[PDB]
Amino acid sequence: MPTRKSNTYLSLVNSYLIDSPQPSSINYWWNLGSLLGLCLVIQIASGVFLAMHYSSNIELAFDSVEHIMRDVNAGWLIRYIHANGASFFFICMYLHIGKALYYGSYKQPRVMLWVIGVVIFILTMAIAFMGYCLVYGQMSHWGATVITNLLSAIPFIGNDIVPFIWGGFSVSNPTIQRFFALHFLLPFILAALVCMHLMALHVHGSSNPVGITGNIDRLPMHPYFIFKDLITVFVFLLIFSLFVFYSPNTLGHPDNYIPGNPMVTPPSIVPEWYLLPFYAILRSIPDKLGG
Amino acid sequence: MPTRKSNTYLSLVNSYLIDSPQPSSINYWWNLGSLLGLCLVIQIASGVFLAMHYSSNIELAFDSVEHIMRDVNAGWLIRYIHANGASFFFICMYLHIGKALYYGSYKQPRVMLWVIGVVIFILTMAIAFMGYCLVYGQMSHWGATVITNLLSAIPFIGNDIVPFIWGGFSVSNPTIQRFFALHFLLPFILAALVCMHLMALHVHGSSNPVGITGNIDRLPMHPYFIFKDLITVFVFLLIFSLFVFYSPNTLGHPDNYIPGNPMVTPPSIVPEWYLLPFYAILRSIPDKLGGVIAMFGAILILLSLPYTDRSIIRGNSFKVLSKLAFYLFVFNFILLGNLGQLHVEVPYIQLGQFATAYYFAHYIIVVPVISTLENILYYIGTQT
Amino acid sequence: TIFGGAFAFQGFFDVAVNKWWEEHNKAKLWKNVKGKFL
Amino acid sequence: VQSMTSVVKAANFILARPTLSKIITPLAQKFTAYAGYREMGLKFNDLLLEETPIMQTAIKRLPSELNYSRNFRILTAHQLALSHQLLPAEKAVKPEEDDNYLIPYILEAEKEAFEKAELDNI
Amino acid sequence: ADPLDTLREECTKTAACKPFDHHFHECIERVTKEQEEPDYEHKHYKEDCIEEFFHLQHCVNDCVAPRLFNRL
Amino acid sequence: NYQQPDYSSYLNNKSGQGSRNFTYFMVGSMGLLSAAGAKSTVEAFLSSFAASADVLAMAKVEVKLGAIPEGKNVIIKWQGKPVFIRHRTADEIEEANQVDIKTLRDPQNDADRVKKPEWLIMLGICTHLGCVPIGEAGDFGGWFCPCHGSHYDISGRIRKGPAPLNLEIPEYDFTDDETLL
Amino acid sequence: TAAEHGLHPPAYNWPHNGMFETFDHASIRRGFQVYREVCAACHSLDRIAWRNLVGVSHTTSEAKAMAEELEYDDEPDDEGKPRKRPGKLADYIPGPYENEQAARAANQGAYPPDLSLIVKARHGGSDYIFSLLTGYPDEPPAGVVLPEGSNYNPYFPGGAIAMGRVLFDDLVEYEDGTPATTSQMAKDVSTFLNWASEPEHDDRKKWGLKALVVLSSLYLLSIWVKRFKWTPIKNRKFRFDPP
Amino acid sequence: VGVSHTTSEAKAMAEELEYDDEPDDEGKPRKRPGKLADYIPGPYENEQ
Amino acid sequence: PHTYMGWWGSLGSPKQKYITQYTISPYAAKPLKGAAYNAVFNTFRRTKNQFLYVAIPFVVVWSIWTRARDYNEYLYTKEGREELERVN
Ligand code: HEC
Ligand code: HEM
Ligand code: HEM
Ligand code: HEM
Ligand code: HEM
Ligand SMILES: Cc1cccc2c(-c3cc(C(F)(F)F)ccc3F)nn(Cc3nnn(C)n3)c12
Ligand SMILES: Cc1cccc2c(-c3cc(C(F)(F)F)ccc3F)nn(Cc3nnn(C)n3)c12
Ligand code: FES
């Protein structure tokens, strides 16, 4: 037996990346998965390198972020990488889900996979929002306020659950510290759901554009689809560099650079672009609970 | 096929916890593993519930800890759970390693497992120390200072690596923030190494006290060993409750409740109890570079243990001289730990040097010599 | 379904322990001592 | 780890000289008796580390009756260790039954492996 | 008189504490005599009663500690 | 087949269906004791999420009241949310005198929305997507919710916009030139 | 050295020592009174707020009155006009000195450490404090030399301590009628400081009792269930009948 | 420094201003010449 | 995957035809048959058998520790002061 198949860890790496029998007909839309993984990795990396300089305290949060930007070596680069990588993570996820819908990867054999994926999506937004609250900009503070207030709509437990999540009577230092901790953690639970998603995929394999059995013609993931993954990864990193270096704040909202104060409400409380489709629904439904 | 074997996740849970074919002869010493897992889990849980109220800033760190103790509901409970659970995690790990040495679970089939375990051990202490530096008590600050100074001993990169780890010219706010981030993360990298350890175990299965093939008589993990794990877990939690509620600060050091200041040096800069055996070596070796090299060797020589153990019989349960040598090694380790916390007095410095000498001599002489002599004695006894 | 028995055990043990603790520590509690310092 | 051939060679190196045999053989017998494996129904060969390709090969070549007796002895030892009880002296493995039944097969396997290594190394 | 002084000065007379008290008195008088001479200020080492005082205090504490709080 | 080992001594003395019933009893007791312990531990941990003693102490904080221009809207910081203390003149009271049983999502009047016209207390947080309303942009003459353009009446009642309710009135009591929360 | 490590204080049978024993809150109030009357001159208690005393040693009204007596730095009108305000229950108890050098110069260079954590930050805790307060002998041991502005107290590491004995007999008038002896005042102050360092002490021990009861029940049940499940394997026998 | 002003120029401008020096911990407040590390002051100490 | 342990169908054990196993439903057996006799007699037997291997190393190590501690105590007492100067 080759060492890549006898050793347990190299055996797993082989089963998933080297000899994984992918259909030969899968186009570039199937390379988003790995891309998303890369995004997660980079995010976590950036996130860690931000935690070494970010201060969870409400009074020090925004000032610590500005310290990262202006004083920490490459702090601007890591901060922008994290911020724009959230948006790029959601771009990759939206294209991921779009491919799943278009090529019918959600059908019977991979229904299990589907559900894990859906959970991940929800979890990811419930990690993105939390991260956006850490900066404690005007938009961050008022988004936290709006979301927590919407949580109060639950009849039996909504009256007192909101202080429970806040840690107080309004978004304040306990809230930001809580969000920082849970936001550092939830991506690491999500890393477990990503592994679960990969196993739910591996049990039945991956679909193909033609929507027929790939068993007639399978190819090992390495080298073919490994190098396709490298192509998409370099394209993603090139566009990500465009945004990070030459236009970082276009995806974000300018008001988030204003130190947040509850006494001043910005003219438009709006999420980052990739939460807009869902928030629109929340705006459309009259009832808060219904919303 | 039962649903517990068809579903991939339930299939894995089955393979590891339900029908995992454990040897029937494994005694309670084999339940420490799961115990350690529980410890890790509880630590992580406590840690998270501390991250929600702890402030990484140097000026706010200790004050935030006291805020947890005095103002946060159940904050004292979580703080003490975390602090004493570090010590209990290391107690379970030391008993884990002692069982592995005594019953020879480090031999050929599981050498890979052994290696992973060793790595975990090192990682664990390099997470414990980090955590101890977060409270920024006097002992926290001065331990960080001592360790980072010792890292300066490396010739080519030691001159400038120390500021690199500090984030400054001395232990300061960047250092504590860096340690907070790395300390929140490294346990989660260790959670991956724990899974790797479990797979390296599952490939060849678990050993048994008798030191022979368990395949003759295997039993499913559930219910038998699940309930044995429950017994050990309740015993561990009962002793943990004793320490947490009725005597929490005994394991810790009082000076850590003094706000740390670089200008005042405490009369005795000493680690918590479970780092004492290693720090003792660091105290015994004159050279700082040699000191750190020997300190890390005291752990890494476990990697050489499988190859220095020339025994043809797994474990020591049936080995007189091996049992005697192992027990003498354990007591020497305890003596080394005890010397770790004492000042540098004459008899203590010579005894620490001799204790380190014998600690390494165990692995590099006694196990080989004793194992070969015992193989010869077995054959020349049964030959008649 | 299980929560019923768990809550029953919790309430029972809590009430019993509280009563015993108050009775055993009676003289040393604030509630009983406040009257002397009034 | 140590090759069974090496330990057998050392044992014969000692036994060939009464000067050392008369001193060590009583000690070896006392050590084996005190080793405590006999009271569990095990013979010395049962303790040998099976998880080695040479040992697995030697076991596979074992005669049927010896293999079944070994299986029963191992099962009895596991049951005794599980129940934390020991056979009395009457049911214990007497010293004379430690026949070293498995040594010849292990030595044959070791000789084959050593011949392979020596031949392919030239 | 507070209970502490009573307990200390009555334990000091027990046969367990008597040798320590005698040693302490001998050491204090000896050190006073040694400090009397002119060279006392120049001697690199000057005798101290810290050890005997510590021994006596330990002996009296181990006798009074389980007793004092019953009075208070 | 053969002679089985004699288990006579090992056999239980108790009934066939009774011993399993007792086994059920103790296994269920273990399960429910474990559930109670887990409930206690989880409740203790989650109780940390709730407001710490500091936040509870900081709340219910009195506000430095006193004389202020009539009709001017002061601002406070009780419990984080802004408090729009306004000393509405008699003109505002007269305007509120007009009852409104219709064309109001929550019919109310100064009888309950304020203890005295000289000191009106009302939280500035809006109803839908809680935001700080503008103190003079209200279409009804009171506060205005810029986020949705909602108009808050001088009495705090929601006149127009996506308001789900009326301007909440804090639980602050009044005293001699002081605010007693 | 024996002196450098400091004499090991004895283990007094505190009313609160023992697994199921709680603090004698009468002693806690006595200790707080002694602290406010005496220790407030030298040592601060920054980490103890009046809110903590309610239900422990003082009725809410009493703590309210004590807080209202003091003047605290109010948040100045943000037009930069500094002012003071009556204290509230949430305000932390002030120290005698605004900052370190005030204390040190007032105390001949030595800094009176904050007592809000001293019990937890010293070997022996309450025993150490009680012995230290009563450790000062009338005459120092012969042969020792005391620097200027220093006093001898064996329980202190090194023997030389800046504080001179302060708990002289009949110092404070206890409001409960208990005699104000130096030993009694030392005991009360030690209990109060132990509470300050471990305010959760009562609740900590009560939760420990609950946890021990529940876990012991679970442990006994698990022993029974394990011996139960293992009877088939414990009682297992074998027979081996080759030809 | 290195952006719009030579190190000497920034040094001189900083030394022109008076910054709140860490008062001698005996509570004696005093001011000090500005250093390169000091943040540029605002016209107003606070908001009102 | 020549793992020296397989799954239940083939755990890697050799052929063991001539062995028979016997057990009674726990629903029919005593849980405490040997508990009383075991906890005393069997526990004492295990302790006695394993004692020497713990005692002899413990005696050696603790004797060395006691010697070292007593010597250090003597050094730091007054009568040892001169020797503390001589050794250092
Ligand atoms: C006047 C001066 C006082 C008074 C009235 C009290 N304390 Fe003390 N104390 C004081 C100083 C300057 C120091 C520092 C001594 C040093 O060497 O640093 C101390 C010391 C203590 C300590 C610390 C002991 C130690 O760390 O080993 C404690 C504890 C202590 N003092 C307690 C204490 C108590 C209970 C008092 C009650 C009235 C008290 N002090 C008053 C200065 C002064
Ligand atoms: C968030 C991190 C994610 C990772 C690491 C990941 C990983 C992968 C990978 C590598 C594949 C195979 C190649 C590919 O499809 O690109 C895959 C398949 C799939 N993923 Fe994900 N994915 C992620 C997000 C999601 C999410 C959130 C969903 C939710 C619906 C999802 C739905 C699917 C589906 C339906 C398939 C099957 C595609 C097919 O069979 O053709 N993915 N996943
Ligand atoms: C799926 C994973 C993650 C996503 C999608 C995500 C998303 C985000 C987003 C959208 C922001 C807003 C930034 C801005 O508005 O400019 C943010 C900020 C932040 N996140 Fe993340 N995040 C993730 C993981 C992490 C991790 C792993 C960490 C730390 C280990 C982290 C720590 C932070 C910090 C400190 C900030 C604010 C720091 C700053 O902007 O200066 N996040 N995150
Ligand atoms: C194997 C895992 C871990 C070990 C062995 C460990 C060990 C320790 C130790 C020994 C201390 C010193 C406490 C004291 O001196 O009283 C400590 C403190 C601390 N650790 Fe951990 N730790 C682990 C994981 C974590 C995790 C997962 C977190 C956060 C999620 C964390 C956060 C903290 C914090 C915030 C403190 C100081 C907070 C306080 O004491 O109030 N640690 N840790
Ligand atoms: C730190 C968390 C750990 C976890 C979660 C864990 C998990 C486990 C488990 C469940 C077992 C089987 C049952 C048992 O042995 O008790 C095991 C076996 C083993 N562990 Fe660990 N363990 C940990 C620590 C370690 C470490 C640090 C070492 C370093 C040497 C180690 C060495 C071993 C060995 C040699 C075995 C094989 C024992 C045998 O086959 O009898 N363990 N591990
Ligand atoms: C600023 C802001 C305003 C209104 C809503 C939001 C949300 C938001 C969050 C969730 C979820 F429950 F998932 F949290 C769902 C729907 C939402 F509209 N989030 N934010 C800040 C933000 N937007 N995008 N990011 C990366 N953070 C808002
Ligand atoms: C306070 C203190 C003093 C001296 C050494 C240490 C160490 C220490 C750390 C490492 C490692 F490199 F692994 F970090 C190795 C050896 C050591 F002696 N740590 N500490 C604080 C402490 N002690 N125990 N904990 C939970 N933290 C010291
Ligand atoms: S402003 Fe969003 S509803 Fe009032």
PDB file of N, CA, C and O and ligand atoms in Angstrom, chain F residues 126 128-129 145 147-148, ligand 8:
ATOM      1  N   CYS F 126     -37.685  54.483  19.336  1.00  0.00           N
ATOM      2  CA  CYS F 126     -38.879  54.263  18.536  1.00  0.00           C
ATOM      3  C   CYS F 126     -39.391  52.838  18.736  1.00  0.00           C
ATOM      4  O   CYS F 126     -38.813  52.036  19.474  1.00  0.00           O
ATOM      5  N   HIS F 128     -40.678  50.460  15.921  1.00  0.00           N
ATOM      6  CA  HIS F 128     -40.160  49.571  14.887  1.00  0.00           C
ATOM      7  C   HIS F 128     -38.732  49.993  14.566  1.00  0.00           C
ATOM      8  O   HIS F 128     -38.493  51.120  14.122  1.00  0.00           O
ATOM      9  N   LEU F 129     -37.780  49.085  14.784  1.00  0.00           N
ATOM     10  CA  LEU F 129     -36.362  49.377  14.595  1.00  0.00           C
ATOM     11  C   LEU F 129     -35.943  50.552  15.485  1.00  0.00           C
ATOM     12  O   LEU F 129     -35.625  51.649  15.022  1.00  0.00           O
ATOM     13  N   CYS F 145     -39.416  59.784  13.858  1.00  0.00           N
ATOM     14  CA  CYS F 145     -38.496  58.675  13.636  1.00  0.00           C
ATOM     15  C   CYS F 145     -37.855  58.814  12.261  1.00  0.00           C
ATOM     16  O   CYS F 145     -38.472  58.460  11.249  1.00  0.00           O
ATOM     17  N   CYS F 147     -35.646  57.092  10.736  1.00  0.00           N
ATOM     18  CA  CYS F 147     -35.399  55.850  10.011  1.00  0.00           C
ATOM     19  C   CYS F 147     -36.566  55.505   9.093  1.00  0.00           C
ATOM     20  O   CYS F 147     -36.360  55.116   7.938  1.00  0.00           O
ATOM     21  N   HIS F 148     -37.795  55.647   9.585  1.00  0.00           N
ATOM     22  CA  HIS F 148     -38.987  55.370   8.796  1.00  0.00           C
ATOM     23  C   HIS F 148     -39.873  56.593   8.608  1.00  0.00           C
ATOM     24  O   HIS F 148     -40.948  56.471   8.009  1.00  0.00           O
TER      25      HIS F 148
HETATM   26  S1  FES J   8     -37.347  54.107  12.627  1.00  0.00           S
HETATM   27 FE1  FES J   8     -37.341  51.978  11.961  1.00  0.00          FE
HETATM   28  S2  FES J   8     -39.475  51.854  12.575  1.00  0.00           S
HETATM   29 FE2  FES J   8     -39.219  53.745  13.811  1.00  0.00          FE
END
